[PDB]
Amino acid sequence: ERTYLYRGRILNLALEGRYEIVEHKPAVAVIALREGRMLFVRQMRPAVGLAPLEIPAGLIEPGEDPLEAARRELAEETGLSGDLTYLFSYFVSPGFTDEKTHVFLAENLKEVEAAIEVVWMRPEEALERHQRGEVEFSATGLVGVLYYHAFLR
Amino acid sequence: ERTYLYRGRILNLALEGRYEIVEHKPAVAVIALREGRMLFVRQMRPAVGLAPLEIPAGLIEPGEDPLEAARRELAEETGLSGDLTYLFSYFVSPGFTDEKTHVFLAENLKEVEAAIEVVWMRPEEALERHQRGEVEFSATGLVGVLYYHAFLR
Ligand SMILES: Nc1ncnc2c1ncn2[C@@H]1O[C@H](COP(=O)(O)OP(=O)(O)OC[C@H]2O[C@H](O)[C@H](O)[C@@H]2O)[C@@H](O)[C@H]1O
Ligand SMILES: Nc1ncnc2c1ncn2[C@@H]1O[C@H](COP(=O)(O)OP(=O)(O)OC[C@H]2O[C@H](O)[C@H](O)[C@@H]2O)[C@@H](O)[C@H]1O
Numbered sequence: 001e002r003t004y005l006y007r008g009r010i011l012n013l014a015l016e017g018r019y020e021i022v023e024h025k026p027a028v029a030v031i032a033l034r035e036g037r038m039l040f041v042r043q044m045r046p047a048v049g050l051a052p053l054e055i056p057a058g059l060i061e062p063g064e065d066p067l068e069a070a071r072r073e074l075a076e077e078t079g080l081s082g083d084l085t086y087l088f089s090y091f092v093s094p095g096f097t098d099e100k101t102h103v104f105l106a107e108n109l110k111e112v113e114a115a116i117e118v119v120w121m122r123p124e125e126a127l128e129r130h131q132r133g134e135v136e137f138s139a140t141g142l143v144g145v146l147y148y149h150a151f152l153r
Numbered sequence: 154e155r156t157y158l159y160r161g162r163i164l165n166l167a168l169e170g171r172y173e174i175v176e177h178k179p180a181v182a183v184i185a186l187r188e189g190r191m192l193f194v195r196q197m198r199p200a201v202g203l204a205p206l207e208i209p210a211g212l213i214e215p216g217e218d219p220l221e222a223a224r225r226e227l228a229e230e231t232g233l234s235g236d237l238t239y240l241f242s243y244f245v246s247p248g249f250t251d252e253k254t255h256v257f258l259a260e261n262l263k264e265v266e267a268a269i270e271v272v273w274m275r276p277e278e279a280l281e282r283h284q285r286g287e288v289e290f291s292a293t294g295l296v297g298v299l300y301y302h303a304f305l306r
Contacts, residue, residue: 006158006166008173011249013159013166019199020161022175024249045247046172052247088283090290093245093252094198094205096164096177101292130241137243139254139292143299150302 010059011097024099027092028070029057029140032082032106033152037120038144039106041077044115052136053119053126055144057101066102074106079113082106087147092139103143123148163212164250177252180245181223182210182293185235185259186305190273191297192259194230197268205289206272206279208297210254219255227259232266235259240300245292256296276301 002014002021012023032039032055042051058073060066067084074080084104092099123145129135137145155167155174165176185192185208195204211226213219220237227233237257245252276298282288290298 009171011173011175013175016199018162020164021200022164022166022250024246027246045244046169047174047249048244048247048251048253052244054247088280088290088295090292090295091198091201091205092292093177093180093250094201094207094291096200097175097246097250098201099246100201127241137241138247139243139245139296142241142243142296143292146296146299146303149304150299 020096022097024097025059025061026066027057027059027099027101028066028073029055029101029103029143030070030074030084030106031055031087031103031144031147032074032080032109033148034109034120036122038123038126038148039078040119040121040126040141040144042117042119048136050136051117052138053130053141054138055140057138057140067104070102070104075112077116078118079111080106080109081112082109101140103140173249175250177250178212178214179219180210180212180252180254181219181226182208182254182256182296183223183227183237183259184208184240184256184297184300185227185233185262186301187262187273189275191276191279191301192231193272193274193279193294193297195270195272201289203289204270205291206283206294207291208293210291210293220257223255223257228265230269231271232264233259233262234265235262254293256293
């Protein structure tokens with residue numbers, strides 16, 4: 001059983017026996033390749049004080065399933081729509097939070113609409129920039145880069 | 154500036170303007186392959202109520218750098234030691250936490266020592282089991298699987 005220390009906007013903090021638990025809405029992330037470039041985004045993230053390289057990602061809000069949330073954040077963050085395929089999911093850090101991320105591939109991208117910086121970048125270059133200390137990754141950004149190298153070359 | 158709502162054992166909860174921020178110690182994770190099997194671990198994770206497929210992972214404690222923490226958790230969780238190479242890092246979920254994970258590759262594993270279940274499993278099978286809904290991934294488990302498919306075949 002959980003006792004709640006804080007009920008917030010995008011998280012709750014609970015204690016469960018000796019365990020500190022952060023409840024958090026699920027998330028989605030979209031991997032998209034065009035002309036050899038992957039679709040990254042960057043935004044200032046106050047939790048870390050910097051703008052890591054991410055792929056388009058967002059929270060699943062009331063009413064939505066993961067596919068719908070993925071289509072929405074792709075459009076809102078980048079102005080694009082595409083044909084989305086579910087790939088896999090992961091718990092971001094299951095030792096303390098229940099946040100689960102559902103990852104999609106987007107193909108056949110179309111601009112549907114003309115704080116978030118869109119960064120098209122070859123994944124090989126993202127990985128080299130990271131290795132040289134020039135940019136940080138989020139989990140979603142790293143998953144995109146690794147998925148590309150595994151399956152999209 | 155941050156105001157603290159909770160100072161805990163493995164996290165602090167702060168507000169920063171409108172932002173809810175979870176401070177958390179950094180983590181490490183180790184990717185290890187032997188005879189075509191990757192070294193996974195499973196443990197009950199109360200935050201999610203299940204035991205996802207992870208790779209050996211742990212927190213960096215006072216006094217330690219990432220390499221040292223990685224060697225320690227590999228030994229404590231699996232009884233193994235190896236030659237460790239730094240690969241890359243990622244922020245697990247930078248929209249709300251500062252947790253950063255440093256990922257290593259381990260080679261030339263040796264048993265140094267005879268709650269945590271050690272699960273050697275071919276990564277192709279881990280990914281198929283996940284696709285069929287049979288097991289969940291942590292971020293570290295998924296990163297291990299993707300890294301293998303990208304670079305270790
Ligand atoms: N929710 C918690 N609340 C209280 N203490 C905890 C909790 N979980 C663990 N402990 C204590 O904290 C001690 C040290 O934890 P270590 O074992 O090095 O790490 P890890 O395997 O848990 O987490 C490693 C990563 O894997 C996952 O993605 C995680 O979220 C991390 O990102 C433990 O001995 C526990 O006593
Ligand atoms: N720390 C926070 N505290 C308060 N509200 C917040 C915070 N961060 C965002 N908001 C609000 O929450 C609203 C909805 O958030 P959406 O934009 O769909 O998601 P995302 O891109 O932030 O996070 C997506 C994932 O990427 C990362 O890995 C994250 O940690 C997630 O795992 C926002 O409009 C903000 O107003």
